[PDB]
Amino acid sequence: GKCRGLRTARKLRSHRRDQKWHDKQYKKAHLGTALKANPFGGASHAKGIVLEKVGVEAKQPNSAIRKCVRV
Amino acid sequence: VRMNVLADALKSINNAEKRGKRQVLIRPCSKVIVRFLTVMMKHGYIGEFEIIDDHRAGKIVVNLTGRLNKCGVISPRFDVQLKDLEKWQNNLLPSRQFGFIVLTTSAGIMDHEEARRKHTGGKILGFFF
Amino acid sequence: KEWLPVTKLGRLVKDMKIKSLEEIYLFSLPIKESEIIDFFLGASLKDEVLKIMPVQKQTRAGQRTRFKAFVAIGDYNGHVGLGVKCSKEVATAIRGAIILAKLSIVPVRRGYWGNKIGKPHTVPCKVTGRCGSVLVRLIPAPRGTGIVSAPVPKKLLMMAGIDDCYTSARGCTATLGNFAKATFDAISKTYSYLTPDLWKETVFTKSPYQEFTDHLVKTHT
Amino acid sequence: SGALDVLQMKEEDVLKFLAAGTHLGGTNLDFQMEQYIYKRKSDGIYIINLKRTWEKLLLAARAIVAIENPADVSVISSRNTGQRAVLKFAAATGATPIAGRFTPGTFTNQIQTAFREPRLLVVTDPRADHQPLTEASYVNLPTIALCNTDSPLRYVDIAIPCNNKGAHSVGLMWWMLAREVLRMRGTISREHPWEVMPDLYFYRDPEEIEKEEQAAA
Amino acid sequence: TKKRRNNGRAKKGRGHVQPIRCTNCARCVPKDKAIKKFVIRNIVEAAAVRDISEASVFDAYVLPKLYVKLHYCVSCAIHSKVVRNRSREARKDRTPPPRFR
Amino acid sequence: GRVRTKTVKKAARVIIEKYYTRLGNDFHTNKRVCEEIAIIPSKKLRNKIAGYVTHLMKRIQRGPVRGISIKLQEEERERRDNYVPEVSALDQEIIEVDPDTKEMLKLLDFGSLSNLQVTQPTVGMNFKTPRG
Amino acid sequence: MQNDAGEFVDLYVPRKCSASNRIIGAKDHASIQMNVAEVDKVTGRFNGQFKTYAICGAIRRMGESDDSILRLAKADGIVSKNF
Amino acid sequence: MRAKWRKKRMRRLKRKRRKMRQRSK
RNA sequence: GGUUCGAAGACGAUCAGAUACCGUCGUAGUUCCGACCAUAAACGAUGCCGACUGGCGAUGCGGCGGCGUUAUUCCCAUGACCCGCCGGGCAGCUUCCGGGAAACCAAAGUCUUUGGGUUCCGGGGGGAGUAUGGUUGCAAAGCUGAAACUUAAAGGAAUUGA
Ligand SMILES: [Mg+2]
Ligand SMILES: [Mg+2]
Ligand SMILES: [Mg+2]
Ligand SMILES: [Mg+2]
Ligand SMILES: [Mg+2]
Ligand SMILES: [Mg+2]
Ligand SMILES: [Mg+2]
Ligand SMILES: [Mg+2]
Ligand SMILES: [Mg+2]
Ligand SMILES: [Zn+2]
């Protein structure tokens, strides 16, 4: 840090506390909006129901019709 | 303004050492600085220094050899026990063979070796090697 | 095959006037020929190839691609060198890099961690070395610790003979050349780092030139 | 040299110093050579301390004499002012001279034809001969240089304060240097004056040469 | 890349100077930044001088001079070849060019 | 354009420095000399070499040359470059000494000088070049 | 250099500058080991011994080598005290 | 796309949004 | 108060097309007084206070010391000069102090040998300084200020070609 005073513990803790939010990984983890946006709700696996089969085109020059399922 | 007289006094001495000056003059003199210089002198890292005092804060002229690589200062003066003294010297000294962390104690200003053999801690002042 | 000396030091070392290599390092004499190194420490001189980096410069005729070879050489006791050279073919690049590494071989100082029993094992002091951006810090370690380091400088330290050492790497260590030269600098300035046991007033010994001056003007022009 | 009447300056040396004008310093002054100057005259010409100049010349003579082989002493002068003085000095003391045009790489590049590695170097003017000094950084050999008040003191070991601008001064300093190094060894006694006059080392202008030939003819 | 230590101007302790309009164009440039030329020129340059002096009523009459202080913008001066670009090492020198003619 | 190339000039220089005794100012003589000495397959090149050799020989016999290093240089210094006047220029009856130089001489142990002359001090401290 | 057993343990002892009191690296090519001869007090000739000084490269490139040589020579008596 | 002109365009877009919000208030 | 200039606008040229670049007029404005507005490449793209670490030529202020010129004229003393020192003020020139990726920097150094005190501020590029909320304002707008989503690059210095 830069303010290394003898009794600046609260200043340092507050600065660290409100500057960790700028890290998008920490903010995404600790904000419920990202967890709500995640379809699984912070779950590794989830059961779904098949609706249709979709052939999606690939990216730039590597191009192919990949197979996907609307679940 | 000037907050720590000890800090810039050591920094001026270190700069003179890096530039290889024969002797260095530090403008302010304090009891802490005099004890610090005596501690280094008794370990042979400096020469024979004089104190030139008017009826104000005096000056100190210190004769310098080439043995001192760096005379650092730690700010603020943290409180160190004998449990964490080994960690402090591990993170602040080149090796376990040499280097001295001078920290003022109940007995007075003395290095970590003398602090250990008297079994007492205190405020950390600085380091030199 | 036989070596004909060109330099003043080379004549003396061929005539065996200087028995050991450390005299040259003592007097800071520049070693300009590679026949001194293998004469002195060729018994246990081992070489490894670090990286072949194909640098290119672009002209109207596309790019003139030539290969740059990094060579790490040295014996496992106290002496190591690093060679860098770029040539248009791999074989010549290696042959030119190894001789540069031999010319650039530098002695190292080994110390003790805590207790000083037996032979030295680790770096005497916390020493840093940096070229460009990469910074490599060497920390003393107790006996049997090993070389806790990245693979690239681990082999250099093993060749340096320091079998116990902690390292800290700062910066873009992906660049092999910067990484190699940074740790080479770190292990080369150990003998230039002042140590309290070196406080003894050294006595200036006899320089090889002033000690064999008659021989120099007698055995050659 | 040190409080020895044998090596003390003589009145004839003072007369030759004044006649050559070696005490005349330059217009400017380098911060590394302010200790060789007594006072600055009106018109802003510095004065070179002759006694300290002589003592420094003695020290340089001691360094040259300390070398065993006389051949491995290299004397350099690229400027024509001391072009023949530097050549005849080495011819007298057995040194190996370079008569101007110090080609770069003569100390570092071993493949070069003029590859020499002398024990000690004596250069005339550092400002005009920076290249020998820079090469002396790569090859460990001490350096003795004749430095005026405007000459920097980088990579030089012994600097003799003298007026390197004047041809007479340069010739006198080299002639005195040759005399001193020959006295310090078993070559010439210190009682009688040296046979060769100092004017032998003085720079001869081609106009001066044809002037002399015209007078003779 | 800071091309110049002083950015094409002599502003060191002001932060703002009065702009001045260009001569050929109407562009305004800071006073220290603009290229300034002070051209002195006779009314007659090369050939007209001899005949006008011959035809003058007064004998040995000295011709007058016109004093013009031209201010050019950077683009205008370079287009008019008042100044030319130089190498990176040759930018730093600022001595005026020789004036033998 | 009649310019000798590097091959002609370099070959002429080394030939002269190796056979300075056998060469002179006569073009035709050294033409046969260089023919016998060096193997030049082309006679036109031989004439070019001989021509430049003669020109360099004239330069050598008239004075020094940078690119030729025969033994003549080693002895030319001790024959006519050893000129010394009968009286040295440093031997003068009176020497002009400024008051400040006289003062530093008084500081030195050389207090009494028989053949000096203290000049009048210069008046007016005007020595710096005007700016611009 | 001494270990606990009392054996000199380093391969060689690097030189130390007589002016800067700093050790000289094995590749500090700017370092100088200079020898100054002494002169007999009554004979005025070379004796046969030397007074040797060491100057580090840092002092040389800084530009204080001549002053360091002058001070050491004066300390060792080569130069007169009056100077 | 110059930063100044896209800043001006987004400023107009904000003005239009503000007016639409005001009229729909 | 509106001289000149000149957004918007009109017209004449250029142009394949010019709603512009060029030219003629030309409203607001550009001027002043009284209220707001508080935004700039508001730049040294470089926080404030304090100590140390090379020289060299200068410059502005005042003080100090000093040969010698030139005025008041009739000389002490005041100016204009000249030669140095002193404190900071804009700066410049050179360097293997040292730094950094380099450009370059006596600070952008005294940073792994990491700590003089202290405020603000950045965490890949966009989305966006956008939405919403609050607040200020006559308005234009200012301050505070996200997310969903998308991408494996965006970027800095420097070298060679073109
Ligand atoms: Mg892709
Ligand atoms: Mg502004
Ligand atoms: Mg139209
Ligand atoms: Mg256009
Ligand atoms: Mg109009
Ligand atoms: Mg307005
Ligand atoms: Mg802003
Ligand atoms: Mg830090
Ligand atoms: Mg981001
Ligand atoms: Zn313009």
Side-chain angles (χ1 to χ4, degrees), chain B residues 24-40:
Chain B
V24 58
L25 170 58
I26 46 182
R27 299 173 55 261
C29 168
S30 67
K31 185 183 303 178
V32 186
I33 293 184
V34 177
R35 298 297 181 180
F36 200 108
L37 294 182
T38 53
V39 164
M40 287 198 300

Side-chain angles (χ1 to χ4, degrees), chain D residues 29-112 114-116:
Chain D
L29 166 58
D30 188 66
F31 81 103
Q32 297 279 4
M33 300 192 60
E34 81 284 50
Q35 60 189 6
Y36 311 97
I37 293 180
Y38 177 78
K39 188 185 174 61
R40 190 184 188 183
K41 303 174 178 179
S42 299
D43 101 309
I45 294 302
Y46 291 101
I47 305 174
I48 304 180
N49 187 275
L50 298 179
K51 187 168 187 178
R52 288 178 283 191
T53 292
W54 166 257
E55 293 184 354
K56 280 264 182 169
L57 202 279
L58 291 173
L59 220 181
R62 301 281 206 82
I64 297 183
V65 169
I67 312 167
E68 293 75 4
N69 175 30
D72 55 17
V73 190
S74 184
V75 288
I76 320 294
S77 182
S78 61
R79 193 173 69 257
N80 69 326
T81 298
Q83 201 58 271
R84 60 169 294 171
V86 73
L87 198 66
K88 297 209 169 190
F89 163 81
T93 193
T96 313
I98 293 188
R101 184 45 195 169
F102 178 81
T103 307
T106 52
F107 295 161
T108 65
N109 193 14
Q110 63 173 353
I111 206 179
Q112 192 170 342
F115 172 67
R116 57 177 70 264

Side-chain angles (χ1 to χ4, degrees), chain E residues 22-27 29 71-73 75-76:
Chain E
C22 190
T23 53
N24 52 20
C25 300
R27 196 170 188 274
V29 191
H71 307 274
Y72 294 93
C73 52
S75 58
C76 304

Side-chain angles (χ1 to χ4, degrees), chain A residues 2-5 8 11 15 19 22 24 27 33-34 59:
Chain A
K2 196 163 188 176
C3 45
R4 54 176 62 93
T8 64
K11 178 66 178 181
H15 187 272
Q19 284 293 336
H22 295 90
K24 60 183 302 181
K27 190 178 181 183
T33 168
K59 286 291 182 57

Side-chain angles (χ1 to χ4, degrees), chain B residues 36-49 128:
Chain B
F36 200 108
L37 294 182
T38 53
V39 164
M40 287 198 300
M41 163 188 289
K42 297 192 68 58
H43 288 272
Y45 285 82
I46 67 173
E48 185 179 10
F49 67 96
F128 63 99

Side-chain angles (χ1 to χ4, degrees), chain B residues 1-4 7-8 11 15 19 21 70 73-75 78 88 127 129:
Chain B
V1 292
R2 190 186 306 102
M3 296 299 181
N4 193 330
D8 63 312
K11 177 155 296 305
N15 294 338
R19 206 181 181 86
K21 296 300 181 181
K70 177 174 180 176
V73 49
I74 296 298
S75 178
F78 294 97
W88 274 96
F127 62 102
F129 50 85

Side-chain angles (χ1 to χ4, degrees), chain D residues 14-30:
Chain D
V14 188
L15 267 50
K16 291 182 175 56
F17 284 151
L18 299 177
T22 178
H23 59 293
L24 303 176
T27 298
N28 286 121
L29 166 58
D30 188 66

